[PDB]
Amino acid sequence: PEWYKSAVFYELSVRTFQDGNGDGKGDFPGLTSRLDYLKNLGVDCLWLLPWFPSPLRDDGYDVADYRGIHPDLGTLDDFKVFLREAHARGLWVIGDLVTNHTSSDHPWFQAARRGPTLPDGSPNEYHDYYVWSDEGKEYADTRIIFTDTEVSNWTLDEQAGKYYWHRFFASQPDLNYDNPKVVEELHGAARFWLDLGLDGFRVDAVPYLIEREGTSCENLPETHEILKGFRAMVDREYPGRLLLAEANQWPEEVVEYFGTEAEPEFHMCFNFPVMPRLYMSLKREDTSSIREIMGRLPKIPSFGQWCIFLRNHDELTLEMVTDDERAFMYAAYAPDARMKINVGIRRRLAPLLDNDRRRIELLNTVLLALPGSPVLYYGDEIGMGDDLGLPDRNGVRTPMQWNAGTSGGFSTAQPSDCFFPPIQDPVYGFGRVNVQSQLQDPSSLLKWTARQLELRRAHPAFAHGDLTFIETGNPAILAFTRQYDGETLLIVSNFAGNAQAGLLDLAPFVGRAPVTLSGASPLPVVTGNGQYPVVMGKYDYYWLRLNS
Amino acid sequence: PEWYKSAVFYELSVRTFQDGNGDGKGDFPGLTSRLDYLKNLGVDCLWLLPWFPSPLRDDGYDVADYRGIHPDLGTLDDFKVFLREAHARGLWVIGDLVTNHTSSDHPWFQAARRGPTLPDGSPNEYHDYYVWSDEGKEYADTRIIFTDTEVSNWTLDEQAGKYYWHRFFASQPDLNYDNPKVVEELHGAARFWLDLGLDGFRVDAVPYLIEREGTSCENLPETHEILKGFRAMVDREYPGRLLLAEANQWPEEVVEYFGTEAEPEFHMCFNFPVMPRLYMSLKREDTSSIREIMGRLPKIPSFGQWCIFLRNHDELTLEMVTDDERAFMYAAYAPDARMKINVGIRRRLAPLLDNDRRRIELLNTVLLALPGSPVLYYGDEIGMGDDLGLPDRNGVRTPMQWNAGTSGGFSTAQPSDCFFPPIQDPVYGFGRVNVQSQLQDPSSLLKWTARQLELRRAHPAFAHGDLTFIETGNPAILAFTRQYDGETLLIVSNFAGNAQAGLLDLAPFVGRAPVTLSGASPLPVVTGNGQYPVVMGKYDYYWLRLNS
Ligand SMILES: [Ca+2]
Ligand SMILES: [Ca+2]
Ligand SMILES: [Mg+2]
Ligand SMILES: [Mg+2]
Secondary structure, eight states, X not given: OOGGGGOOEEEEOHHHHOOSSSSSSOOHHHHHTTHHHHHHHTOOEEEEOOOSOOOOTTTTSSOSOTXXXXXXXXXXXXXXXXXXXXXXXXXXXXXXEEOSBOOTTSHHHHHHTTOSBOTTSXXXXXXXXXXXXXXXXXXXXXXXXXXXXXXXXXXXXXXXXXXXXOSSOTTSOBBOTTSHHHHHHHHHHHHHHHHTTOOEEEEEOGGGSOOOTTSOXXXXXXXXXXXXXXXXXXXXXXXXXXXXXXXXXXXXXXXXXXXXSSSBOOSEEEOTTHHHHHHHHHHHTOTHHHHHHHHTSOOOOTTOEEEXXXXXXXXXXXXXXXXXXXXXXXXXXXXSGGGBOSSEEOOOHHHHTTTOHHHHHHHHHHHHHSSSEEEEETTGGGTXXXXXXXXXXXXXXXXXXXXXXXXXXXXXXXXXXXXXXXXXXXXXXXXXXXXXXXXXXXXXXXXXXXXXXXXXHTOTHHHHOOOEEEOOSOTTEEEXXXXXXXXXXXXXXXXXXXXXXXXXXXXXXXXXXEEETTTOOBOOXXXXXXXXXXXXXXXXEEEEEEEO | OOGGGGOOEEEEOHHHHOOSXXXXXXXXXXXXXXXXXXXXXXXXXEEEOOOSOOXXXXXXXXXXXXXXXXXXXXXXXXXXXXXXXXXXXXXXEEEEEOOSBOOTTSHHHHHHTTOSXXXXXXXXXXXXXXXXXXXXXXXXXXXXXXXXXXXXXXXXXXXXXXXXXXXXXXXXXXXXTTSHHXXXXXXXXXXXXHTTTOOEEEEOOGGGSOOOTTSOXXXXXXXXXXXXXXXXXXXHHSTTOEEEEOOOOOHHHHXXXXXXXXXXXXXXXXXXXXXXXXXXXXHHTOTHHHHHHHHTSOOOOTTXXXXXXXXXXXXEEOTTSOHHHHHHHHHHHOOSGGGBOSSEEOOOHHHHTTTOHHHHHHHHHHHHHSSXXXXXXXXXGGTOOOOTTSSTTGGGOOOOOOOSSGGGGTOSSOGGGXXXXXXXXXXXXXXXXXXXXXXXXXXXXXXXXXXXXXXXXXXXXXXXXXXXXXOOSOTTEEEEEEEETTEEEEEEEXXXXXXXXXXXXXXXXXXXXXXXXXXXXXXOOOOTTOEEEEEEOTTOEEEEEEEO
């Protein structure tokens, strides 16, 4: 019933998607010119990365003005026409709300570092917007997220003569959520955009808002309380809008970000826990880690929906796996040391899978078949690669590859003048991987993706169904049912690189006939004790309905 | 065994493969520079299209000098070094021997058209090298092969004042094999090349040598007798050399080109009969035509070996199928009328299969898994397309696509200066489809092909085994065994575009365990009555061994 539950999401970065004025930077007019492509793909909601004024030290997640549009992306008018046109096509759009911190170039912080009092005796009302310390000795049981860059979560400010807190880069000072004026400022920022018609927000780094002595400073009850506040505001003032949480934590802690029926928080949260186990299972040819980790996720509220994903603008995060699992992933998916960043792996989806289309298809089917609303990362529809020559996580944020012309069609500016260089290598470069090609190619990955979303869209049980794992007698083979409104789907997936045999426990479905979702080819009726023998080719996916 | 039985063949055209001197024309030095690529691919024998002097009215199959090298391709020295280097790498090489006719520019024909007697009263000894008629009324129960171009197999020569015979173009007059001088001329031509160390010949258009009143003028006993003469000569003078027949006929008539143990003809013949049924079965999702047509092929001599192929330098021939089968193929594989030529379809393999890699892989596995020695058509290993803007069958003979540089790496001459233009379209063009890319791409089609030939090479039962079709209870699924030297291979192939179920009749193999040839994953042991249930994903191939 709520729109987000049946939507397909698409994550993109305006500066990196389409340049409309030849300066090497993506912009809103450019994005707007590509809306037909997104609609045709089968996308329903666009999630745009931060578009606000910013020195871009963390690519826009260091925000310097919550109520504007970064100059290189265009103007606020350009934004309003973009939104009009998106809505004209039946697309929703959500922004990225950066709550935990601002840029050090935010006027607030420039004001705040003047000290507790102005030179004229008056109180500096902005000073307590941020989190200050005399010695930087507090919150010591606290981990560092940007392990490769920051040595400490406290940094000394020259002119303020005190240490300030930051969970991310030193140029991203944390906001102080014990100060109620800060809560107002952000309720107000969100309002500004929701008043223009924005359909919601992806909310950034939600676990880290409140910090408390003698705790990890993650997932604190007071942090959750503030988030309940946001949801309460939106429910009252902007019914129907979406709030989606970036909360990368273990299952028990992630689910709490939905809140409860009585005290709601987020409508949606990313399913961070399943994501690594997908990759792990593929290398191990053993899907048990998927069932285990999915099994640890409690039921969610009635309004709740998972956002399922494979990759995104960040590294493949390994922060919320065991030390053994982390080491395995590095060994398997980060052979070069240059591939690691801050407890994670900074590679695009296709390279991670050795550009093996069968493996790419497989994981995409799992993405679309698990319970939640799926999100695609821009460029993965065509099999884009990465560029590890770029610092930080920018190697997975190269320009979208539209055609084989100048700079992949992203801009008329030459490749070395683009904000990030478009990829030109013989395997993943825009000469070989681009939209124009794949639109004309009857069997391209783009076309496959669209066809597969069409298929999903035609079976609501994917969006809304329950989930029940089936025993297969072979850990390489992952089987489950999705049931909803009388419909029973059976999804069988082979994570091995060669043919595999299984014995499915279909005892609950004796007497019923499985048929392929695609073309209704019938398989043998389920008989006897219901132990159903199968064979599967390498990386096969069987999308079935059980007819009664 | 004989070398040809375990060889993998590769068909290529020198003018079109690699240019070494920037004139837009492929040549021998160029070819020689690409021998490592062919060896590494897993090729054993190169079959070169005609390399002889010629006006190229049928792309070199109109021969004007049997004992030379066409100037565009280089010199006779260039040839000798090419051969030495091929042999240095353990590669065999065969040429194309054009027996049935010559160019009208051949000195023989220039001499012959002077008439039976010279202007000085002397007899013209060359006049009877060709086949002449006063009225062109003879051999009227005879079909026309180039239906789109030729209205008659007789053509009036201006200066000779008589009609001459030609099964092919009017510029390709048939040689007269009732004149024994002609037989000597060609025994001699073959000798010239075999003396240089050439390992054999593909022999062109063998059914059409002798023509007789009141017959079809195809497959005549006197034609076969002459071919026995060629074989006899090579067996005596050049033991170990290969003779491979182009004989496109129905099963009963093709097999006769092997001759018998007592009177041998050809070592190898192309398996023309199976080829169309492969394509048909895929569209119909019903493999019965393959079993039917394979079933009609009699056993062949001990020295005999089939040459299995999917495509070649000609059209996809529909001359030897039923009228109903022909109409179906046109409907399914020739939607544009421009795609038909002379009772066939002039398209490359990948375009025929909608560039669907799964379908490409499938047919390739079948090519490699049927009994015979397989032949690859140059460029199909990377998924090359075609150019229907070129006349006749030249649209499948575009330059090999080596890299994304100038003219696909085929030449430094620009694309409009190449002999045939290298393909530039967004789907199949050299920017997207080339060797360099696929060598660097871990999961490319090139790499797949090589990996799959490796796999074949490791199981001699593919080359030498018998063949037995297995009952599957589903026409979409084609199963068979190949047995040799105690080894039993089981090959199961799905020709449907969605998942299929089968029940394999493995009664003869109760108690034995099928394992994947690739990685030895075991499947359930064959039990009970031996009726073995399977499921297959779309276009899957299962390559299995049955272990005792
Ligand atoms: Ca904080
Ligand atoms: Ca003849
Ligand atoms: Mg711009
Ligand atoms: Mg040349």
